[PDB]
Design a binder for this molecule. Structure first.
Ligand code: Y01
Ligand code: Y01
Ligand code: Y01
Ligand code: Y01
Lengths: 575, 575
C-alpha cells in the first residue's frame, strides 16, 4: 500500500515553512514589531490553539486509539528527556546545571506538534491513515503533562539553591512546577476537552462546532506566522561552548528522538499487522523530526533561563527540521515503490526542489545584483556561485522535460546541468579560497579573471572529459547516472577537490565576511554529505535500492543548495 | 427549492460574532493591548486577507459570473454613496463637510464582506447555490475601486481647501486618491489575482495552493478576532448631533442599502429564472446588511477624520448587523416553507436563541450576584429583570420539548413561560420607574417589596386571567398563540402598560445609572417592536403567513432580550 501520500509533503512543507518565512520577512521588515507580535501570539496560544485542542479532544474516539503507539512515543520522549537531563546534570557546572537540566530536556523533546506537526501529518496521512492525526492531540499534551513539570521543577530547584536554602519545602517546588504546567492552555484545554468528550458523547454541539472551527482553523497559519515573527533576531553570536551544546540539542531533537521513537514503536507496539506496523513506525520517526516548540523559547525568555541556546536552537531546529522531514519521509516511503515509479518520483522531487530553489535563487541573485554588492570581492564570487546554482536548478527543470525525449537535447542539457553542478562545487572551493586570500593576503591581489575562468572552465573541462571517456548510460532516467559509474567518479573527484580546497582555505583563514564564511561552511557540509553519499554509491557492488536512495541524497543537495544561498543572501538584512 | 440552508445561519452567526466577542473580551481584559492588537491586524490585513483574495481570484470562473447581479449590487452601493454623499454635502457645516462627505458615504457602503460576509454567505448558500460565494470577492474589491477613491478625493479636497488654496492641481488630488486606493491590499491583490487567473488558466499551482490555503483559512477567525479587539473603547460618549448622524448612517448601511440592493437586482438583472431571481434578490438583501468594514475605522483613526462617529458607528453597525442578518434571512426564507414545517422552524429558532440567551444570562446573573451589586437600587431591579429573562429562556427550552406532548405540562410550562415573559415587560417598566425615583425622588424611599411584588405578581395575575377568560388553542404549536387572540391581546396590553410606564419614567427622568438607562431604552425599543408586531397581528383579519412572521418578530425579542442584558451587564467592565 502507498502508506504516505508523499507527493503531498513538499506542498505541505512549502505551506508551513512559507508561512514561517512570511512571518520572518514581516518581522525583519518591521511590518510587525516585536511588541505587536505578542498580539498574534496571544491570539494563537490563548484563543486559536485552545479551541483547536478542545475541538479535536471532544471529537476523539478514545477506543479507536493505539495506546501502545502513544506509550512508545511518550517513552521515547521520556527517555530522551532522561538522557539529556542526566547528561546535562553530569556535564554542566554547579552554578547553572538545574536551569540547563530544566530546559535542555524540554528542548530535546517538546516538538512543535500543533503548528508544524499537524499540517505535515495531515498531508502525509489524512488519506492513507486518517487516524494518525489523533495522536498529535494525544502525544503532544500528554508529553507536556509528563515532562514540562519535571523541567519546571529543575528550574525552581535552581532558584531554591541560588537563594542559598539547604532545601525549600519539596511540596511547594513540585506543586508550583505542576501548577505552572496545568496553567498552560495546552494541558487544561485537553483536560476540559477530555471531560466534554465524555459529557457530550463526542457530539460537538452545532452551535459550538462552527465557533471552534473558526478559532481552530485560524491556528495553523497564525501560529506558523507567529513562529516566523519570533525567529527575528534570535540567532545571537554564540561561543563555541554554546554552539556545540546547540548542535548536540538539535541532534537530540531531530536525530536521536526520531530514531528512539521508531525503535520504541517497534519494541513496544507489537500487536498489529506488518503493513500497519511499518507505517506506524515510519510515522513515529517523522513525529520525532518536528522542530522544538516555540513554548520553550517563550518560557526561556520569560524565566530568563538559557535564552541564547534555547531561542537560537528553536530557530535552527525549525529550519533544519524542514529538510530532515523531507529527506526522512522520502527515505521511509522508498521501500514501498517499485524501481521505475521510484525513479520518476525522485526526478519529480528534483523538479519540485529545483522549481522553488530557482525562484529563491532568482530573488537572491536579483538582490545581490541590485544592491550592487556583486562588484566587490567576495560578493562577485558568491554571485557566480548563485549563477551556477541557478543554471543547476533551471537545468533540472529542463532535464525533467527532456529526460527520455531525445539524445541531442539530453546531451546539451546534461552538459548544462552537470557543468553548472560541478561549477557549484568548485565555486564553494574558490569562494572559500577568496575568503582566505581576503582575510590573510590583503596585500596580494586576487586574480578575478583566473578565478572566474577556473570556476566555469574547470567544470566544463570535467564535463567534456566525461562525454569523451564515458559510455552513454541512456537506459537511465536519472541525470545523476546518465554517464554511469564514471559520472559518479567525476562527481566524487570534483567534490573531493572542492572539499580539499574549501577545508584547506577555511582552516588557513581561521589561522559580509561572516555570511560568506557561513555559506562556505554550510555548502562544505553539503558537499561532504554528497561526497560520502557518492563514495558509498561507488563502493556498493551488491545491487539494491540503496543506489536510488543515495542518488536522492545527492539530488537534494544538488538542487536544494539554492536554499542555503537564499537563506544567507536572499534574506540578508543588509540588502 | 430550499434556496438558503437557513438552519446553518445561527451557528454561523455564533461563530462569527462569538469570535468577535472573544476578541472584545480579550481586549477589554487586556489579554491583548491595543499596541499588541496591531500585530494581529497587520497579519490579517497584509498576509491572511491578500492570500485569501489571490486564492479566490485565481480560482474564479469569470464566464460563470452573473454580471448583472454584480452591476446591480455595485449600482446599489454607488447610489447609497451618491445619496449619503450629496446629503452630507448639503446638511453639514463648511468647515468639515468634505471630510464628512468623504467618509460617511464610504461608511454607508463598505460592508465587512470578507470577515463577516463570507462565512455567513457560505453558511446560507454553499450547498444550495455555491456560486453566490464568488460575488463577495467580486463586489467588495470593485466597490472599493469605485467608491473608496471618491471618498479619499473628498478628504484631499478638505486638506487642499483648509490650507487656503483657491484650488490645487486636480490631477494630484485625483491621483493621490486613486494611488491610496490602489495601495489597499484588497485592490492590488485582486488585480494581481485576476492577472494570474488568466496566466494560470485558473489552476493554482500545487506548490502555492496549500500556502494560500494556510494563509487564507487563517483570515476568517483572525479578522473577526481583530475586529473584536478594535471595538474596545470605541463607543465614545457622543453628543446628540453625533448620535443622530450615527443612527442615520447605520440606517443607510443596514436598512436602505439592503433595500436598494434587492430593488436594483430586481430592476437590473431581468435575465433569469424565477427561483434563481428570487434567491438572488434575497442574497442581494443579505449582502447589504453586512456591517461597516473595519478599514473605514482604520482610515478614520489614522487620518484623524470623523473618528468618533465612524469608529463608534462601525462597532454599533457590527453588533446591530447580527440580529438584522438573522431576522432578514429568516423573513426572506419564510416564503419557501409550508406552514407546518415553518411553525416547527420558528420554534427551533426560538429554542436556539433561548439556549444561547440563557447561557449569556446565567453569566450575566452570576456576574451581578458575585459582584454583590445586586443589593443596590437600581441593581436589584435589573437582577429581577435578568431572572425573568432567564425563566423565559428556560421556559422556551422546556416548551420546545413539551410543545405537543401533554396538556398538564403544557399548561404549567405556558404559565411559567408567559408569566416570566410578561414579567420581563413589566420589569422594563418598573426598572425605568426606579431610575426616575432614584434620580429625581432621592428623599423618597423606593418600595422594594411593592416593586418586586408588582414585577412578579402582576404578570402571574395576567397569566391567571388569561387561563380563566380564554380557551386552550391546543391546535397551535406556538407558545405565542397557545391561548389564541386573547393571549396576543394580553401580551399587547402588557406591552402597552410597560411602554407607557417606561416612556413616562425615562421622560420624567430626563426632566451604574447610564448602563441601566441604556438597558431600559434598548428594551423599550424592542418592546415597541413587539407591541407594533402584536397590534399588527391583532388588526390583520385576512389570513396569511404574516401571522407567523409577526410571531417570529415577537419571539426574537422575547427570547433574544437576554443578549441586551448580556451586552450591558455581562460585559460591564466595572464587574
Ligand atoms: C530543500 C528541501 C529538502 C525542503 C524544503 C526546505 C524549505 C522548507 C527551507 C528552504 C529555505 C528555508 C528558509 C531559509 C532562511 C530562513 C531564515 C532563517 O533566519 C534565521 O535563522 C535567523 C534568525 C534571526 O533573524 O536571528 C530562519 C529560517 C528560514 C525562514 C528557512 C525556513 C525553511 C526553508 C523555507
Ligand atoms: C540543500 C537544502 C536541503 C538546504 C535547505 C536549507 C537548510 C539547510 C536550512 C537549515 C539551517 C538553515 C540556516 C540556519 C541559520 C541561519 C543564519 C541566518 O543568519 C543570521 O542569523 C545572521 C544574522 C542576521 O542575519 O541578522 C541566515 C540563514 C541561515 C544560514 C539558515 C538558512 C537555511 C538553512 C541553511
Ligand atoms: C439572537 C439573534 C437575533 C442573533 C444575534 C446573536 C449574536 C450574534 C449577538 C447577540 C449578542 C451580541 C453581542 C453583545 C455584546 C457585544 C459587546 C459590544 O461592545 C461594544 O459595542 C462596546 C465597545 C467599547 O468597548 O467601546 C460589541 C458587540 C457584541 C460583541 C455583540 C455582537 C453580536 C452578538 C454576539
Ligand atoms: C435583541 C436581540 C435579538 C439582539 C441582541 C443584540 C443587539 C440588540 C445589539 C445591537 C446594539 C448593541 C449595543 C450597542 C451599544 C452598546 C453600548 C456599549 O457601551 C460601552 O461599551 C460603553 C461603556 C463601557 O462599557 O466602557 C455596551 C454594549 C451595547 C449595549 C451593545 C450590546 C449589543 C446590542 C444591544
Amino acid at each position: 500500500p502507498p502508506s504516505m501520500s508523499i507527493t503531498r509533503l513538499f506542498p505541505a512543507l512549502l505551506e508551513c515553512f512559507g508561512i514561517v518565512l512570511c512571518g520572518y520577512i514581516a518581522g525583519r521588515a518591521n511590518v510587525i514589531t516585536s511588541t505587536q507580535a505578542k498580539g498574534l501570539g496571544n491570539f494563537v496560544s490563548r484563543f486559536a490553539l485552545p479551541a483547536l485542542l478542545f475541538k479535536n479532544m471532544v471529537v476523539l474516539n478514545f477506543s479507536n486509539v493505539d495506546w501502545s503507539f502513544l506509550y512508545s512515543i511518550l517513552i521515547a520522549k521520556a527517555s530522551v528527556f532522561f538522557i539529556v537531563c542526566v547528561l546535562t546534570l553530569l556535564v554542566a557546572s554547579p552554578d547553572s546545571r538545574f536551569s540547563k537540566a530544566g530546559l535542555f530536556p524540554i528542548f530535546a523533546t517538546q516538538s512543535n506538534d500543533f503548528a508544524l506537526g499537524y499540517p505535515i501529518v495531515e498531508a502525509l496521512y489524512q488519506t492513507t491513515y486518517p487516524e494518525y492525526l489523533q495522536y498529535i492531540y494525544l502525544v503532544a499534551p500528554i508529553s507536556l503533562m509528563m515532562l514540562n513539570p519535571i523541567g519546571f521543577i529543575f528550574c525552581e530547584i535552581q532558584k531554591w539553591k541560588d537563594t542559598q536554602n539547604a532545601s525549600q519545602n519539596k511540596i511547594k517546588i513540585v506543586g508550583l512546577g505542576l501548577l505552572r504546567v496545568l496553567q498552560n492552555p495546552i494541558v487544561f484545554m485537553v483536560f476540559i476537552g477530555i471531560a466534554f468528550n465524555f459529557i457530550l458523547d463526542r457530539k460537538v454541539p452545532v452551535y459550538v462546532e462552527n465557533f471552534l472551527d473558526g478559532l481552530g482553523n485560524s491556528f495553523s497559519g497564525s501560529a506558523l506566522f507567529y513562529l516566523g515573527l519570533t525567529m527575528v533576531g534570535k540567532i545571537k553570536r554564540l561561543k563555541k561552548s554554546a554552539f556545540v551544546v546547540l548542535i548536540l540539542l538539535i541532534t537530540a531533537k531531530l536525530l536521536v528522538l526520531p530514531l528512539l521513537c521508531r525503535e520504541m514503536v517497534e519494541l513496544l507496539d507489537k500487536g498489529d499487522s506488518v503493513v500497519n506496523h511499518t507505517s506506524l513506525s515510519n510515522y513515529a520517526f517523522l513525529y520525532g523530526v518536528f522542530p522544538v516548540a516555540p513554548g520553550v523559547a517563550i518560557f526561556a525568555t520569560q524565566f530568563n533561563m538559557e535564552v541564547e541556546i534555547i531561542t537560537s536552537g528553536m530557530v535552527i531546529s525549525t529550519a533544519v527540521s524542514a529538510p530532515i522531514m523531507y529527506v526522512s519521509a522520502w527515505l521511509l516511503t522508498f521501500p514501498t515503490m517499485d524501481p521505475k515509479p521510484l525513479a520518476y518520483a525522485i526526478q519529480n522531487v528534483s523538479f519540485d526542489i529545483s522549481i522553488v530553489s530557482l525562484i529563491s535563487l532568482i530573488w537572491s541573485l536579483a538582490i545581490l545584483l541590485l544592491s550592487k554588492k556583486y562588484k566587490q570581492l567576495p560578493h562577485m564570487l558568491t554571485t557566480n556561485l548563485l549563477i551556477a546554482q541557478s543554471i543547476v536548478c533551471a537545468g533540472m527543470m529542463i532535464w525533467n522535460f527532456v529526460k527520455e525525449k531525445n539524445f541531442v537535447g539530453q546531451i546539451l542539457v546534461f552538459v548544462l546541468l552537470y557543468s553548472s553542478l560541478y561549477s557549484t562545487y568548485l565555486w564553494t572551493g574558490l569562494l572559500a579560497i577568496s575568503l582566505f586570500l581576503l582575510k590573510k593576503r590583503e596585500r596580494v591581489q586576487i586574480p578575478v579573471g583566473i578565478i572566474i575562468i577556473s570556476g566555469w572552465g574547470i567544470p566544463a573541462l570535467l564535463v567534456g572529459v566525461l562525454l569523451i571517456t564515458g559510455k552513454h548510460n541512456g537506459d537511465s532516467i536519472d541525470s545523476a547516472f546518465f554517464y554511469g559509474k564514471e559520472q559518479m567518479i567525476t562527481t566524487a573527484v570534483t567534490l573531493f577537490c572542492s572539499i580539499l580546497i574549501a577545508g584547506i582555505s577555511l582552516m588557513c583563514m581561521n589561522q559580509q565576511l561572516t555570511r560568506h564564511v557561513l555559506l562556505c561552511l554550510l555548502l562544505i557540509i553539503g558537499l561532504f554529505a554528497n561526497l560520502s553519499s557518492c563514495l558509498r554509491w561507488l563502493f556498493n557492488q551488491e545491487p539494491g535500492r540503496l543506489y536510488v536512495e543515495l542518488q536522492f541524497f545527492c539530488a537534494v543537495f544538488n538542487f536544494g543548495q539554492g536554499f542555503i544561498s537564499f537563506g544567507i543572501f536572499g534574506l540578508d538584512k543588509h540588502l
